[PDB]
Amino acid sequence: PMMAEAWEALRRSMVFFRGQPVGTLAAVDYDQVFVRDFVPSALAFLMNGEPDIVKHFLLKTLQLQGWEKRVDRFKLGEGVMPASFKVLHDTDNIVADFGESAIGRVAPVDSGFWWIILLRAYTKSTGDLTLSETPECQKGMKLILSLCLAEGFDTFPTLLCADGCSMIDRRMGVYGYPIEIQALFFMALRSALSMLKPDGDGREVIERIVKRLHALSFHMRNYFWLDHQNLNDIYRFKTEEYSHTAVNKFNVMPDSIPEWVFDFMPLRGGYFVGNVGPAHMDFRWFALGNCVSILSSLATPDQSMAIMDLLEHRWAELVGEMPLKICYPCLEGHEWRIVTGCDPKNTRWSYHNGGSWPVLLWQLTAACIKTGRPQIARRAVDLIESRLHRDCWPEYYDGKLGRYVGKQARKYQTWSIAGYLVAKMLLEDPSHIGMISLE
Amino acid sequence: PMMAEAWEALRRSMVFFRGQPVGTLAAVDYDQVFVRDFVPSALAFLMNGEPDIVKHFLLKTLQLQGWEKRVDRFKLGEGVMPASFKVLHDNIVADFGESAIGRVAPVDSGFWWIILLRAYTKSTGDLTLSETPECQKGMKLILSLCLAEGFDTFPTLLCADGCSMIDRRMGVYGYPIEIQALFFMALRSALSMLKPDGDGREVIERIVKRLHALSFHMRNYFWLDHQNLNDIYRFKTEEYSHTAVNKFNVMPDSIPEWVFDFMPLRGGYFVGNVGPAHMDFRWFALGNCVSILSSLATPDQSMAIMDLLEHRWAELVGEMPLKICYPCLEGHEWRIVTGCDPKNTRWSYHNGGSWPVLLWQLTAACIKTGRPQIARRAVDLIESRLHRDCWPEYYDGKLGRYVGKQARKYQTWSIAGYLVAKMLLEDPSHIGMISLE
Amino acid sequence: HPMMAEAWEALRRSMVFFRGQPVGTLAAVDYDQVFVRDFVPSALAFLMNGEPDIVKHFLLKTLQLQGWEKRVDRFKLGEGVMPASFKVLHRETDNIVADFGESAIGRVAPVDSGFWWIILLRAYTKSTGDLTLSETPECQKGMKLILSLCLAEGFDTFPTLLCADGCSMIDRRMGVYGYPIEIQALFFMALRSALSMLKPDGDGREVIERIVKRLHALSFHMRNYFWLDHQNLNDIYRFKTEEYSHTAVNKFNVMPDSIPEWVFDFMPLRGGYFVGNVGPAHMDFRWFALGNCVSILSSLATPDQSMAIMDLLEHRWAELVGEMPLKICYPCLEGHEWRIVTGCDPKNTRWSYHNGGSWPVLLWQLTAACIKTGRPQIARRAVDLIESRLHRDCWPEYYDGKLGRYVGKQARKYQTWSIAGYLVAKMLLEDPSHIGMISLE
């Protein structure tokens, strides 16, 4: 079909280090190997039967994790994973970016979770348990887990985050406890138990992971979940509840709930709220967060069915003419001025502020297979197969329906192609969802 | 003179446990023993010569630190200090955030414990309390919570909304100057009594290293004067490099208009917040005062803060010291930042309200900087209405002419701060108890 | 003090030579060409110092550029169209490259360049007394060519010149379309200075008639409609609407309720100024510095109106001048006005580049007009304010802020005309006899 052209583009975007495939580029015209950008390419190669690139990638990124990172005078964490790295020749040499060179000095919290998830996907797709059992991978797993599982003044089981900590590397503002980071956190924890060897300290770390997983499953299914009944209850909430036994636990103002939520909420269906914190509640629908919540089994089968129901009812809003919107709705006017800090790349229905991202398709596909609703993924596949190739594989789309190409979208984006390839192979062989899902 | 009335109120607000005085109340009509609320009362007793209450408070709060705290299914940190506690007829009950409105976390409680311990050991000279194994363990626990490794690419401590003195949503998330200044002061005061035995040698290495990272990061990025503001106004955007000028990618057009008019030619202050693409230009009183007391600010920066206080006096002080922050969020800003919080309206409780308790911080900072006349002006201005209004919790308005909308009369720390400020102005030799160099 | 010597070092370093001949000065020495409006103050400085050969070469070279074949996409430009700027192609052999709007951002047209050429020619012939240059057939042809473009007939029902946005010193979208005072004042001054040096041979007698006729139409239209004082503002506030008749009071049907709130508070009891723009149902009340200064220098404003402008400058000093002279316009567009008028232009933010920014180069105009009005203390105060910070900031292009306390957002350091304006203003303060070189009566 016209998908082979996509594989030509995917193979053209390969980056080699000393003869071995180390990764895929970000854009082929974003000229380095990004972790989140390489995840779909790695899944495509794993399903096609070429897992050596993923093998080299995990190990080289692990070596980068063991580097001495420093920002002006501050020594970075031990388990901090790089956001990207580039290769040079004049004598190959790898250079990594942990946030010192990143615009705005953002921290890639999702990189470590993606590394653990990719390691689990590799060991499940290949069945070769040797790599996950190597001392290096165990060290990397413990290093990344010790950064987030460490105790602190936190009164929430969820992971606290600064703005620009997830795929959305700009102020939008994903600070606090965004569903994207919490879902990736839960998935990485569960996948960590799937391959961790209990050493003297290993048994203790496993105990910590299990306890945190229980606290997370409870906090996420009870507070982040939102359906019509729960929204009505929050609308009827009382304020100023200073007691151990309080109903309105986080003191959310019922009048502060935006007007769009009441009209957007259908009778059947629900989703996970974008953020929940002290007196804060971001009601925005985030695609990656809900998809990972479904894949990591964080959402109950009923909640997953409700997410699919909401996707079918409010389809034009969450998908439109081009899947898939990164978040709904978008920030406008004052909301854009204060939350984004007058960021011009995140305009109305743009890059991170409501833009349509084709790469998200594979996630939508995977969750759809896990929930038993393949027709939804097929609808999205037919929608993407009609315009993605014609537009030379853009990075992102803009507009309420995604009818327009992004304002600053890069053509021939690597993961925009890899996501389509992964989604098509998943539709052809659903048996691959076990590589990216848990129960 | 007719100043001991405040001492009568301070002595009436004492809370005893098993016969011994353990602390002071929050309000005498906020009904428990709060850490931040007890700090000024403890300083007043330390200066008057009654340090037994401070000792019992530190020891009992340390015992509370060793409790097994739980939030629904989540085990809180080991070194987490409680925000408040009350005595029930005689068993102590503490709140670590499970009962707090909005489930806010008291990040400043741990730092306040260490600062109060240093103040006690310096005021009394009795090094025995700081050298006991229990308090040493408490110091190491609180230090291990903040010095812990993480995804952070900033030396400053990440914070959720509602982390200190502002227990509500106000935009204090990220790296607010109040928490960073208290962090720096607690870090410096921890070395003043940490023994090098066992783990002490290792932790001492950590505290010193982070102290270097903070002093730089605070003096280079958080500081703001007319020249620095002009430079940020002329900043270039989208800087992807280790050698970038606009390190945090702040949008020059996003700088609010009030900053350009508020900035005088002489003087400066520390910016309220600095984070990824975020820079809160609001002036916070407690943060700058602690930055001066902890010597975090250079002598020139402290003199600049005093210069700004003298030039834009009506804005930061007005008819009632001291405004908690300037300016206040209005309209859309209030709707988005506070989440439509009604207790923080225009020039109110946390959103620009005038707090009398802050006076002592202003006083000490004035003595350390060599500008006592400013503190005398604030004292002469406050001594005319604090007692007449039955010691309110906070004042509202652009000038503080009106009492708070929901202010509690006879607030304990509002009285203790005035007493501490008067004792500091009368005897400046006490600033060593709350300052470093 | 010899700080003018430092300013002159910078001015002489910005000289541009063409195949051995000095043709002009650059715009910025770090805007990297020879601009007409940018060269006007430098030319005045050299004329006052006694080095007029550079001005002679500039006028002749610009006339030669006027004799070029200009084209934009498929359209042949006007015959008398003057270039906005030009650059030299070094580094042994030089070559001329001119910009008439084809290379300009937004394809803006420099309407003021021709008027500045005529005004500069009059200034040269008056400063040197050498009438030979203006009487050459080439200069007469250039004057007639530029005059035939603006004096041409059209559907216009207004004596003033219709203009597109970004046609004056303000090369960007700012709402200066229509009949801005800057272009009208430069037009009036160029017309009078054209009569000051036009020969009556052949067609000249014919053109002299046109220039005179339009001058009568302008002097009236400007003094009766564009002028604005407290009494006139009160009258417009009491205006009636829908006046369809030859004898109408509200001639342009301006809505009294549409007058902005800032105008009533800004208008003092003593003093007045010329309104920024007047057209069909449109009236931009913004105060433009260059327009009023040229209206004073060209004697377009009566002595009473000039005294009123100085009175307004004394009363509303912090608004029009502040800590750094001189604001290009007052007030600035904010919020919705900025979104609609500027089209979301980021270089013209609040109290910025063209939207209320402080420009040091304007000082010389403020100086000249003050000497013409007999109020030197105003110019001396502005000179002291500039002499206290302009050199310390390495001669910025423009300043931002309500008071001008901050350097421009995108200001270029060591701007040529920002230095030349200071030198011209100081030379005018030292020898007021030079104002005749830039003024009419």
Side-chain angles (χ1 to χ4, degrees), chain B residues 36-53:
Chain B
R36 64 188 64 70
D37 283 58
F38 178 72
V39 168
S41 313
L43 296 168
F45 284 132
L46 282 172
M47 290 173 198
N48 201 27
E50 325 173 12
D52 40 32
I53 175 160

PDB file of all heavy atoms in Angstrom, chain B residues 36-53:
ATOM      1  N   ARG B  36       5.006  28.575  61.858  1.00  0.00           N
ATOM      2  CA  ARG B  36       5.275  29.934  61.408  1.00  0.00           C
ATOM      3  C   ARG B  36       4.651  30.958  62.344  1.00  0.00           C
ATOM      4  O   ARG B  36       5.207  32.046  62.535  1.00  0.00           O
ATOM      5  CB  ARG B  36       4.771  30.117  59.976  1.00  0.00           C
ATOM      6  CG  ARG B  36       3.263  29.970  59.816  1.00  0.00           C
ATOM      7  CD  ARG B  36       2.844  29.968  58.348  1.00  0.00           C
ATOM      8  NE  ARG B  36       3.373  28.826  57.604  1.00  0.00           N
ATOM      9  CZ  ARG B  36       2.984  27.562  57.768  1.00  0.00           C
ATOM     10  NH1 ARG B  36       2.158  27.229  58.751  1.00  0.00           N
ATOM     11  NH2 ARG B  36       3.524  26.610  57.021  1.00  0.00           N
ATOM     12  N   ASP B  37       3.504  30.627  62.941  1.00  0.00           N
ATOM     13  CA  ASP B  37       2.856  31.546  63.868  1.00  0.00           C
ATOM     14  C   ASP B  37       3.620  31.642  65.183  1.00  0.00           C
ATOM     15  O   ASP B  37       3.594  32.690  65.839  1.00  0.00           O
ATOM     16  CB  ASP B  37       1.414  31.098  64.125  1.00  0.00           C
ATOM     17  CG  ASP B  37       0.477  31.451  62.984  1.00  0.00           C
ATOM     18  OD1 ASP B  37       0.737  31.006  61.845  1.00  0.00           O
ATOM     19  OD2 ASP B  37      -0.514  32.172  63.222  1.00  0.00           O
ATOM     20  N   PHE B  38       4.294  30.559  65.585  1.00  0.00           N
ATOM     21  CA  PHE B  38       5.041  30.525  66.840  1.00  0.00           C
ATOM     22  C   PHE B  38       6.441  31.112  66.740  1.00  0.00           C
ATOM     23  O   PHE B  38       7.011  31.477  67.774  1.00  0.00           O
ATOM     24  CB  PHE B  38       5.136  29.081  67.344  1.00  0.00           C
ATOM     25  CG  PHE B  38       5.918  28.932  68.613  1.00  0.00           C
ATOM     26  CD1 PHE B  38       5.393  29.370  69.816  1.00  0.00           C
ATOM     27  CD2 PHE B  38       7.176  28.362  68.604  1.00  0.00           C
ATOM     28  CE1 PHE B  38       6.110  29.241  70.984  1.00  0.00           C
ATOM     29  CE2 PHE B  38       7.899  28.228  69.769  1.00  0.00           C
ATOM     30  CZ  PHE B  38       7.365  28.668  70.962  1.00  0.00           C
ATOM     31  N   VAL B  39       7.000  31.216  65.538  1.00  0.00           N
ATOM     32  CA  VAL B  39       8.350  31.764  65.373  1.00  0.00           C
ATOM     33  C   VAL B  39       8.515  33.124  66.053  1.00  0.00           C
ATOM     34  O   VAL B  39       9.445  33.288  66.868  1.00  0.00           O
ATOM     35  CB  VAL B  39       8.734  31.867  63.885  1.00  0.00           C
ATOM     36  CG1 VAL B  39       9.996  32.705  63.730  1.00  0.00           C
ATOM     37  CG2 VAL B  39       8.929  30.485  63.286  1.00  0.00           C
ATOM     38  N   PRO B  40       7.674  34.130  65.765  1.00  0.00           N
ATOM     39  CA  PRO B  40       7.882  35.423  66.439  1.00  0.00           C
ATOM     40  C   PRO B  40       7.658  35.362  67.939  1.00  0.00           C
ATOM     41  O   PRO B  40       8.379  36.031  68.692  1.00  0.00           O
ATOM     42  CB  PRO B  40       6.883  36.353  65.737  1.00  0.00           C
ATOM     43  CG  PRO B  40       5.841  35.458  65.217  1.00  0.00           C
ATOM     44  CD  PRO B  40       6.530  34.191  64.833  1.00  0.00           C
ATOM     45  N   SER B  41       6.685  34.576  68.403  1.00  0.00           N
ATOM     46  CA  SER B  41       6.466  34.476  69.842  1.00  0.00           C
ATOM     47  C   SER B  41       7.692  33.878  70.516  1.00  0.00           C
ATOM     48  O   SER B  41       8.103  34.317  71.601  1.00  0.00           O
ATOM     49  CB  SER B  41       5.220  33.638  70.123  1.00  0.00           C
ATOM     50  OG  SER B  41       4.147  34.048  69.294  1.00  0.00           O
ATOM     51  N   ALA B  42       8.307  32.892  69.858  1.00  0.00           N
ATOM     52  CA  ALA B  42       9.505  32.269  70.397  1.00  0.00           C
ATOM     53  C   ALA B  42      10.642  33.272  70.453  1.00  0.00           C
ATOM     54  O   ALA B  42      11.400  33.301  71.427  1.00  0.00           O
ATOM     55  CB  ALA B  42       9.898  31.061  69.550  1.00  0.00           C
ATOM     56  N   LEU B  43      10.772  34.113  69.421  1.00  0.00           N
ATOM     57  CA  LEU B  43      11.832  35.117  69.449  1.00  0.00           C
ATOM     58  C   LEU B  43      11.595  36.119  70.573  1.00  0.00           C
ATOM     59  O   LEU B  43      12.545  36.566  71.231  1.00  0.00           O
ATOM     60  CB  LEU B  43      11.929  35.829  68.101  1.00  0.00           C
ATOM     61  CG  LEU B  43      12.322  34.953  66.913  1.00  0.00           C
ATOM     62  CD1 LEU B  43      12.104  35.690  65.600  1.00  0.00           C
ATOM     63  CD2 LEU B  43      13.768  34.499  67.051  1.00  0.00           C
ATOM     64  N   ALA B  44      10.331  36.474  70.813  1.00  0.00           N
ATOM     65  CA  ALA B  44      10.029  37.411  71.890  1.00  0.00           C
ATOM     66  C   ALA B  44      10.414  36.820  73.240  1.00  0.00           C
ATOM     67  O   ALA B  44      11.040  37.495  74.069  1.00  0.00           O
ATOM     68  CB  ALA B  44       8.547  37.791  71.863  1.00  0.00           C
ATOM     69  N   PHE B  45      10.069  35.550  73.470  1.00  0.00           N
ATOM     70  CA  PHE B  45      10.439  34.927  74.738  1.00  0.00           C
ATOM     71  C   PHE B  45      11.950  34.763  74.851  1.00  0.00           C
ATOM     72  O   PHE B  45      12.510  34.897  75.945  1.00  0.00           O
ATOM     73  CB  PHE B  45       9.736  33.581  74.911  1.00  0.00           C
ATOM     74  CG  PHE B  45       8.287  33.697  75.283  1.00  0.00           C
ATOM     75  CD1 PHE B  45       7.326  32.959  74.619  1.00  0.00           C
ATOM     76  CD2 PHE B  45       7.888  34.550  76.300  1.00  0.00           C
ATOM     77  CE1 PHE B  45       5.993  33.066  74.961  1.00  0.00           C
ATOM     78  CE2 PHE B  45       6.555  34.660  76.648  1.00  0.00           C
ATOM     79  CZ  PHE B  45       5.607  33.918  75.976  1.00  0.00           C
ATOM     80  N   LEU B  46      12.628  34.481  73.735  1.00  0.00           N
ATOM     81  CA  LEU B  46      14.079  34.331  73.772  1.00  0.00           C
ATOM     82  C   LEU B  46      14.750  35.646  74.144  1.00  0.00           C
ATOM     83  O   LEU B  46      15.732  35.662  74.896  1.00  0.00           O
ATOM     84  CB  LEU B  46      14.591  33.837  72.420  1.00  0.00           C
ATOM     85  CG  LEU B  46      14.430  32.348  72.117  1.00  0.00           C
ATOM     86  CD1 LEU B  46      14.798  32.058  70.672  1.00  0.00           C
ATOM     87  CD2 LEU B  46      15.282  31.522  73.062  1.00  0.00           C
ATOM     88  N   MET B  47      14.228  36.762  73.630  1.00  0.00           N
ATOM     89  CA  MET B  47      14.809  38.059  73.952  1.00  0.00           C
ATOM     90  C   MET B  47      14.465  38.496  75.370  1.00  0.00           C
ATOM     91  O   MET B  47      15.265  39.191  76.008  1.00  0.00           O
ATOM     92  CB  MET B  47      14.349  39.107  72.938  1.00  0.00           C
ATOM     93  CG  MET B  47      14.955  38.908  71.561  1.00  0.00           C
ATOM     94  SD  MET B  47      14.283  40.002  70.298  1.00  0.00           S
ATOM     95  CE  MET B  47      14.786  39.121  68.823  1.00  0.00           C
ATOM     96  N   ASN B  48      13.295  38.104  75.880  1.00  0.00           N
ATOM     97  CA  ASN B  48      12.925  38.471  77.242  1.00  0.00           C
ATOM     98  C   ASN B  48      13.649  37.637  78.294  1.00  0.00           C
ATOM     99  O   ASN B  48      13.695  38.043  79.460  1.00  0.00           O
ATOM    100  CB  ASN B  48      11.413  38.342  77.442  1.00  0.00           C
ATOM    101  CG  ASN B  48      10.910  39.159  78.622  1.00  0.00           C
ATOM    102  OD1 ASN B  48      11.512  40.164  78.997  1.00  0.00           O
ATOM    103  ND2 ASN B  48       9.807  38.720  79.219  1.00  0.00           N
ATOM    104  N   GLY B  49      14.210  36.495  77.912  1.00  0.00           N
ATOM    105  CA  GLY B  49      14.913  35.628  78.830  1.00  0.00           C
ATOM    106  C   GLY B  49      14.139  34.429  79.336  1.00  0.00           C
ATOM    107  O   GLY B  49      14.449  33.931  80.423  1.00  0.00           O
ATOM    108  N   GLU B  50      13.148  33.948  78.585  1.00  0.00           N
ATOM    109  CA  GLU B  50      12.334  32.789  78.959  1.00  0.00           C
ATOM    110  C   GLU B  50      12.408  31.791  77.810  1.00  0.00           C
ATOM    111  O   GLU B  50      11.465  31.665  77.017  1.00  0.00           O
ATOM    112  CB  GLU B  50      10.894  33.201  79.268  1.00  0.00           C
ATOM    113  CG  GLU B  50      10.776  34.565  79.938  1.00  0.00           C
ATOM    114  CD  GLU B  50       9.339  35.026  80.081  1.00  0.00           C
ATOM    115  OE1 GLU B  50       8.424  34.204  79.866  1.00  0.00           O
ATOM    116  OE2 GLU B  50       9.124  36.216  80.403  1.00  0.00           O
ATOM    117  N   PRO B  51      13.525  31.076  77.679  1.00  0.00           N
ATOM    118  CA  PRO B  51      13.703  30.126  76.570  1.00  0.00           C
ATOM    119  C   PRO B  51      13.197  28.708  76.809  1.00  0.00           C
ATOM    120  O   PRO B  51      13.425  27.853  75.949  1.00  0.00           O
ATOM    121  CB  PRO B  51      15.233  30.111  76.396  1.00  0.00           C
ATOM    122  CG  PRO B  51      15.811  30.955  77.539  1.00  0.00           C
ATOM    123  CD  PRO B  51      14.720  31.131  78.531  1.00  0.00           C
ATOM    124  N   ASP B  52      12.536  28.419  77.930  1.00  0.00           N
ATOM    125  CA  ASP B  52      12.071  27.055  78.165  1.00  0.00           C
ATOM    126  C   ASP B  52      10.941  26.660  77.220  1.00  0.00           C
ATOM    127  O   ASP B  52      10.860  25.496  76.795  1.00  0.00           O
ATOM    128  CB  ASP B  52      11.617  26.911  79.616  1.00  0.00           C
ATOM    129  CG  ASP B  52      10.862  28.131  80.114  1.00  0.00           C
ATOM    130  OD1 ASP B  52      10.166  28.777  79.302  1.00  0.00           O
ATOM    131  OD2 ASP B  52      10.969  28.447  81.317  1.00  0.00           O
ATOM    132  N   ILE B  53      10.074  27.610  76.866  1.00  0.00           N
ATOM    133  CA  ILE B  53       8.966  27.309  75.969  1.00  0.00           C
ATOM    134  C   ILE B  53       9.484  26.945  74.583  1.00  0.00           C
ATOM    135  O   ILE B  53       8.963  26.032  73.932  1.00  0.00           O
ATOM    136  CB  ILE B  53       7.979  28.492  75.933  1.00  0.00           C
ATOM    137  CG1 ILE B  53       6.875  28.256  74.900  1.00  0.00           C
ATOM    138  CG2 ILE B  53       8.711  29.802  75.670  1.00  0.00           C
ATOM    139  CD1 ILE B  53       5.635  29.100  75.133  1.00  0.00           C
TER     140      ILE B  53
END
